[model samples]
Target: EDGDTPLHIAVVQGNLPAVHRLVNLFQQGGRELDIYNNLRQTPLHLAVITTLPSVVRLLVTAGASPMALDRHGQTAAHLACEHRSPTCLRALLDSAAPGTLDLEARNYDGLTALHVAVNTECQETVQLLLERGADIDAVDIKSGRSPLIHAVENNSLSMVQLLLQHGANVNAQMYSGSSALHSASGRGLLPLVRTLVRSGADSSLKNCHNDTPLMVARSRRVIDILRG
Candidate 1:
């Protein structure tokens, strides 16, 4: 019990056999399903962070609560997305106990799984979360920037398109009134600017500085596209 349990060690090692055996024994032994380590991370949280789908499945089947929060207020689901561990995440999604698959679960930063996926630019994980109904337009509480805006800021053109395909709001403004178009334009991302325009992003929208997307355009090509 030195900050971690036998289950925690097994999970950290990603020892599927040991994890399975421990889970079985714990279930029959009436051991705590959501034991926390020094970090307040459960065995399931370790399983997700380590990308151990088998371990995750075993823990869930053993009645481990997927909703258990770490010291950072991150659930196993949040860590899965944050770590871009899709296989483990999918396993958790499937084996999650009733009312446990909260895709909208926010960390202290108020970032959902979709936000984490987009911020990390994990396209596959983003798609997986989206297919499972992650909020495409979920915004960060501190910055008020949506997932699409994060993609734009990261200059992830493909990820931006992916969010758009999943119904991301092209003109969704941040707390600073900066839209995805404003972000792409300022960064001189021509192709992304074009894509946002085609997707109906309003170039006329102004930020808190009163700078329209066109006003912030640093690239001739971006300025040209916004003008025409």
Candidate 2:
């Protein structure tokens, strides 16, 4: 009810107490729950990202749905996971069981929570999502590109390892017929190159251009890996 909606103050100062107070007040009205600031984030999303786990939990328990999506289709949980705050993420995840939670819920781009976690190379977050029934092979709706494709494209070696170990279709082809190996080679990531090959990255895989992983590399490192 203040000139500053709960989100306005929460986002500006990252204030857990003020957020906690406002969340409780808004819980009764249901008008304050999903209020967005200039950034289009709900109080829960702001609380998680601004490092206020207490506020996050308070809002969640007060019936402020952490699963509420903002303009970008990002849930408070998704924001928490992206911010790499295990505490906030766990709080959101704990709000619902892995099966009950929509960890596979995608954004406007059809990118899942796993997709965001992969971009950050957050193995723990990845593991938590996977353990909670995240589809490791879920593809982006618009492009039909898989998280494995994202991991390789992002040049995240450790993430690739986790995904591979979790059964990420090492040879899964993208909408463009490009493979993860194609990406690793393009990035000239040696360890990732070796890991893909050792795990059967399929250097033979081709893209829409009929280019192989070996052909994608501009660096001698990739050339050396190819030669080896």
Candidate 3:
């Protein structure tokens, strides 16, 4: 019932020695080795924060669950991906369960990992998630915005292209019923405006406020593009 464990101390202090001892203890205790820390974080989460990849592999090979979520509903894999550590990310992805993509684990913002990565503008991580089968269309529950909306709102052309290539609807609407095209037009994103237009984005599409992309460009850069 006690929270004190050799694995906890080893991981917290980055002490590989303590991890070795804990492995032996588990073997002797006839336990499954899926131990949890006081924070409800299994060894994987500890390994992530500590950068102890070896310990993470040891636990996973020994039958630790990759599906374990910390108190924040963040999986170890999510934490690794968030920190931009491909090493930590690989460890989780290798042994991840078949349905891990569908688990619906949300970060503290109530957003899935895919939602956070779009705002990061890191193409590699976003691609990694997509390769792992994450929903490119996953929306942020708080803002009701998909990854496409975020990419457009932030003027991230690469991300926007990626989301579009991954099948994100350019016309998809978000909070206040604003479409990605509406945001791009509002922010004077000429290159993005061009990209969306070529991708068959409907300039005639209206938001919930009855605002069209061309209407937004009237006050922004739409006139220049339209005139040129």
TM-score of each: 0.93, 0.80, 0.84
Highest-TM-score candidate: 1
Give the Cα lDDT of each candidate: 0.86, 0.77, 0.75
Q: What is the per-residue lDDT of model 1 for residues 68-174, given as tens digits with 9 covering 90 to 100?
A: 88988898878988888889888988887777678888898788888888888888889889888778888778899888888888888889889899898899999
Clash number by candidate, in order: 0, 0, 0
Error of 2 at 73 (Å): 2.1
Which order, best to worst by TM-score?
A: 1, 3, 2
User: Per-residue lDDT tens digits of candidate 3, residues 120-163?
Assistant: 77777777778877877777678888888888878888998898
- Superposed by TM-score, candidate 3 places the C-alpha of residue 168 at a distance from the truth, in angstroms, of 2.4
lDDT of 2 at 64: 70
Minimum summed lDDT over a 10-residue window in model 1 is located at 1-10
Worst 10 residues of 3 by lDDT: 95-104
Roughly what TM-score does model 2 have, to 2 decimal places? 0.80
